[PDB]
Amino acid sequence: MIGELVKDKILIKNIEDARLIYKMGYYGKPIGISKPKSAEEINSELILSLIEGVYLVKKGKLEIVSNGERLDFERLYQIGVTQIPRFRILYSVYEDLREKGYVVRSGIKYGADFAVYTIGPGIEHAPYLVIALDENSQISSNEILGFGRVSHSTRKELILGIVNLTNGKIRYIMFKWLKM
């Protein structure tokens, strides 16, 4: 498994490698398709985000190169910090959730950071929406109101992933828009 760093994303040019990385656990998105039922229908280069790439590298399931240079975890992580806003808190939740066995996808279509899934041999579940947060970052009422808006929009489960960048621990707090 080898991938090319191109800006803020990682390109998987080999289709076999692509289909394999995707089979592993629904990583990346193929170019031109939105979301493949199976890796079987993937025929275009697999595109991985830095968050996904950095995870896979750390998992030893992927090597990354940037025009000759071989970027390891320390370097890739650092690039994520520079390129991607909120990279630290986003990777912390991505990793933690991924490490716990959930299948983590982008949650932007739903107005959140991630779309977390519980899957297994012949088992698919509804997507939990997670929004990563820096425990200290001050949230406004307008943002908090924006939260409870994305929640009862696709009426799924909205969840805040509060990360401590020091100890790396994570506190998950879910909230619903109530109708007192």
The token pair at 6 is 């191109």
Residue 49: which of a second copy, Cl ion, none does it interact with, CB under 5 to 8 A by kind?
Cl ion
* 3-state DSSP assignment of residue 135: coil
| 49 scored as a contact of Cl ion (CB under 5 A) | yes
Residue type, 96: D
Helix (H, G, I), strand (E, B) or coil at 146: helix
Interacting partner of 40 out of a second copy, Cl ion, none (Cβ under 5 to 8 A depending on kind): none
Nearer to Cl ion, 19 or 95 (CB): 95
Residue with smaller CB distance to a second copy, 56 or 158: 158
Binding mask 139-168 for a second copy (x = CB under 8 A): xxxx-xx-xx-xx-------xx-x------
Out of 7, 23, 70, 176, the only residue in the binding site for a second copy (CB under 8 A) is 176
Three-state secondary structure string covering 35-65: CCCCHHHCCCCEEEEHHHHHHHHHCCCCEEE
3-state class of 162 per DSSP?
strand
- 123 contacts a second copy (rule: CB under 8 A): no
Instruction: Please give the backbone phi and psi of residue 160, each rounded to the nearest 5 degrees, phi first.
Output: -95, 125
Question: Least distance to Cl ion from the beta carbon of 106, Å?
Answer: 5
Q: Known catalytic residues?
A: 117, 125, 156
